[PDB]
Amino acid sequence: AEITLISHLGSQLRDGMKLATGRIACREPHDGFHIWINASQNGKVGHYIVQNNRHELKVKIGGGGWSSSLIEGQRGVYRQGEEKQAIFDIMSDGNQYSAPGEYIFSVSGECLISQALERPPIKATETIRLTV
Amino acid sequence: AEITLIGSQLRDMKLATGRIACREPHDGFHIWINASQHYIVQNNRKHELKVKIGGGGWSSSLIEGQRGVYRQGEEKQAIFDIMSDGNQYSAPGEYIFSVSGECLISGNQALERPPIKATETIRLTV
Amino acid sequence: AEITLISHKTLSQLRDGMKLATGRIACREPHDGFHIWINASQNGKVGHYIVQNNHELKVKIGGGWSSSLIEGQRGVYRQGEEKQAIFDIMSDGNQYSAPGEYIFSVSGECLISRLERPPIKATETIRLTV
Amino acid sequence: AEITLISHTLGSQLRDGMKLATGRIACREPHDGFHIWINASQNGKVGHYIVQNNRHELKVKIGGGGWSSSLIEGQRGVYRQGEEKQAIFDIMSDGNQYSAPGEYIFSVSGECLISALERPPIKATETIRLTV
Amino acid sequence: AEITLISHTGSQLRDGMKLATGRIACREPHDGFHIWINASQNGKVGHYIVQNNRHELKVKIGGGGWSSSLIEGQRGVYRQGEEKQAIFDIMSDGNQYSAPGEYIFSVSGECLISRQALERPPIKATETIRLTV
Amino acid sequence: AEITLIHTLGSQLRDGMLATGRIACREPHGFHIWINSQNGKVGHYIVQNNRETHELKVKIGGGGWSSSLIGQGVYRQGEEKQAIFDIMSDGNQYSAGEYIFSVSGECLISRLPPATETIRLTV
Amino acid sequence: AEITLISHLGSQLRDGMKLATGRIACREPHDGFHIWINASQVGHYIVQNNHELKVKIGGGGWSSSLIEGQRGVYRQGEEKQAIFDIMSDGNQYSAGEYIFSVSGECLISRLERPPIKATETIRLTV
Amino acid sequence: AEITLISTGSQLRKLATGRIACREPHDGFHIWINASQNKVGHYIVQNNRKHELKVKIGGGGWSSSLIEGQGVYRQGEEKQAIFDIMSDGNQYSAPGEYIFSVSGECLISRLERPPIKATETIRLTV
């Protein structure tokens, strides 16, 4: 429901290298989070390809306590919890030597609600400028 | 549509294993446990045994409808586990719960629930 | 020992807790906890400060962060062996903001279990522009 | 900090001190006293004004107890003691007058004063349509 | 006894946010004010849920200087005072999302009378206002 | 129908403060309580000394207590047995003495009944 | 210098559900208060049954602190007295007795710790 | 804007050494100790928990300064500058704790003080 993204990069990206950190925060009570990147999926759920702003970069989203998900019917990564905020990373997906410059894309996410469990009516979206 | 299923401390490992098979053309699989919610299965005859289902060719899923885990796929069979959710101890008595599952159909990657649902039982011998 | 700050835009009425800036403290070498502060005038409670325009702004730092003195250094603290921690610079109480810019200098360290302050300290600057 | 103005169609016959509109000023921050005024040409004493129709004139004053006229450097207005969070005020007919029907549109500004004592960096300002 | 309502227009609402603001005027002598919304209660008097025309806003009424009340035995919020008028708001009851559409707030109120020992008067006012989201 | 009460302080006192009260309603039943001095904020009070007619600003509740009129205080909904509460200072002030509070309370029932205790404090 | 403790029902535990309520009193002039629970731990704890429990301390005007190098919750004031709570945090269940050890100092601003330290024990009967 | 401070005998005649760094372009450095004055750059430090010890700051790459009412300064656009906090002459020191702090700013040609100053504290037994 509220998403903050912090940018950090250099061309040599090792696998699982942290490219950007993110935080999703929820103001109303909730059970669980899910997030995703608004880009073409590149293989497994949560892995993606993003274009240079004038060259490509393979990223993935998540980190500890996140794992891939399909939630009516939004593909992303999911983490359980009722806490107010959760941390996540955007990581390099594989070793890659990337062309310098800006890779701009957005991230979305929701604070899931409940006995049923449900997507809230509003999703957050924030844009990040990833600089290589 | 077709499911076959197979100490006092544990963290992390197996408790039962299983396969869901889907004879007809389909797009994915979809399974869960029928118990309170990752689940908590109530003792028979006060303590709470924590379990989870899947195995990570499986993904956390909410379809309609139903929470549980899923896997995209046109193949016939898919294997899964029933594990223990984190470190825990075990009180005596029996533990009884069940596993359901369905062969998902794509309308058109848009996974949807089919008419038939399989359910199998576990009376978990301690 | 590595800090990245971003600022939030918008707009004259700040509500208590409102996020002015967000930061990431990263520790690459193994460690036991984080430790951050603002280089700015103290204002009552430990993680609370006063920053000037060019009108002044009352702010606080943190968010699972605890007020702390470590070897006499005031700041906020969190236990953690994880690689990174996120923090905010927030409005302390309701107040207004004169248009203009407020410079926040933030410092931080990766504490080590044997608590001890390291010999290396990060320091970064972000400007809140109103 | 926050001003709301609600107007009582008033009719052309305006008796002295007749309520034409009701206002509220609300302060978040801790504060010592309130401070309000109309952005129009002063007309005699402090807190007394003339407003022109949106094509004749209307004579109004602001306050109504315990509001008192004030110069708070260097802003002329009317003023109220306290640390309470809102205070209510009136806009009144200043003297008996017979007024041409229609709209008299003007703004009202004000500040929460802070404790020793001084003005805050910004004032509030709201617009009222007085309908005769 | 006399009530005037103004409405304030995204999709979200923070706790305490003003959806509408109102005045209750009392010409005749009185020792208090007494208001409520005519809608399904929801928890504390006077907190309510309001239907969209098709979606539920939880709203609350009163604000600074209004205490929840139960007078003969009308539930609402109240305020002592002999002054001629009083300002109140209709506020978002917690953080929530707003389905678009129309919401009708129907507000009633009364100029309380004494014989400190407050009593309901013979006059009640009711006014309608439509919130647009 | 059951209240228990309890507190030095020294002259100095800010806002926010023991106090302490505690009303017990264990028969099938709401909770409101009050101090037995009208001062414009229900339920905020003023209590005179035992020398002449000094005085003190005071309020009751503290947490899940809202101001209310029910022709009587502050109040909390819930069906539990006890209803813990405090009484604090209404304003930071000086105070050169003994001030005594009558505290009352009731148990509110159904679809909206026929307890008074006294406490004293010292500064 | 001095701490005094008081217990309190049911077996279900939600959030902020008080469990005890103590009071701390430094006679000598001093700038503040400073208290914790002695249990393997933020100011939130786990206190075993003689299974477990999860618990928090402070409430009111109390905030998490770390003061050279004692983790607690603290507050300021020359006020010769201060009052606090030990309470639940979020939904949970509870199977007898629980003993909390509770300590506390009075701080100085010279904010530092004195040689004198209080410790009191209190029982949680459920 | 950025300083590193390296900082417990009854007798003495270097209590700490430190550097101030200035990453953004600037034209000089300005530092001082927070404590009662004694020349300018010379200070008298009291001990809470009576007596006092005379300290002085800099090291003669440093000149006595008063900039907008406030220590010692040094011209230069390089990124760093080193300084010492040394005992002001031979003196005796009774038991107790000696607390004080050092601050510095990066001066700009356009000289005058920037909005940012960094501070570091020293505390001493003997």
Author numbering:
A (entry chain C): 1 to 8, 11 to 56, 60 to 119, 125 to 142
B (entry chain E): 1 to 6, 12 to 17, 19 to 43, 49 to 56, 59 to 119, 121, 123, 125 to 142
C (entry chain B): 1 to 11, 13 to 55, 60 to 68, 70 to 120, 127 to 142
D (entry chain D): 1 to 8, 10 to 56, 60 to 119, 126 to 142
E (entry chain A): 1 to 8, 10, 12 to 56, 60 to 120, 125 to 142
F (entry chain H): 1 to 6, 8, 10 to 19, 21 to 32, 34 to 40, 42 to 58, 60 to 76, 78 to 79, ...
G (entry chain G): 1 to 8, 11 to 43, 47 to 55, 60 to 104, 106 to 120, 127 to 142
H (entry chain F): 1 to 7, 10, 12 to 16, 20 to 44, 46 to 56, 59 to 79, 81 to 120, 127 to 142
Published text:
Different AAF variants are expressed by different EAEC strains, where they are required for the bacterium's adherence to small and large intestinal mucosa. As with Afa/Dr polyadhesins, AAF consist of two secreted protein subunits, a major subunit (A) and a putative minor subunit (B). In the fiber, subunits are linked together by donor strand complementation (DSC) with an N-terminal Gd donor strand segment of one subunit inserted into the hydrophobic cleft of a neighboring subunit. In this study, we report X-ray crystallographic and NMR studies of monomeric, donor-strand-complemented major and minor subunits of AAF/I from the German outbreak strain and AAF/II from EAEC strain 042 and provide an atomic resolution model for the structure of the entire fimbriae.
The minor subunits AggBdsA and AafBdsA have more similar structures than the major pilins: 117 matching Cα atoms are superimposed with r.m.s.d. of 1.2 Å. The donor sequences derived from the corresponding major subunits form classical donor strands (Gd), each inserting five donor residues into the subunit core structure. As predicted, the minor subunits have no N-terminal extension that could act as a donor strand: the first residue in the mature protein is structured and immediately followed by the first strand A. Hence, this structural evidence suggests that the minor subunits assemble by accepting donor sequences of the corresponding major subunits. As such sequences are only available in tip subunits of major subunit polymers, the AAF minor subunits are likely to be tip localized. Furthermore, the significant sequence identity with the AfaD tip invasin (>60%),which has been visualized as a tip subunit, together with the ability of AggB to functionally complement AfaD mutants are also suggestive of a similar localization for AAF minor sununits. In minor subunits, strand A is not split between the β sheets, but locates entirely in the sheet 1. Instead, strand C2 that in a classical Ig fold is hydrogen bonded to strand F, in minor subunits is hydrogen bonded to strand D and hence belongs to sheet 2. A conserved disulfide bond also stabilizes the minor subunits. However, this bond connects the BC1 loop with the end of strand F and not the beginning of the fold as in major subunits. Interestingly, AggBdsA also bound to fibronectin but with significantly lower affinity (∼100 µM).
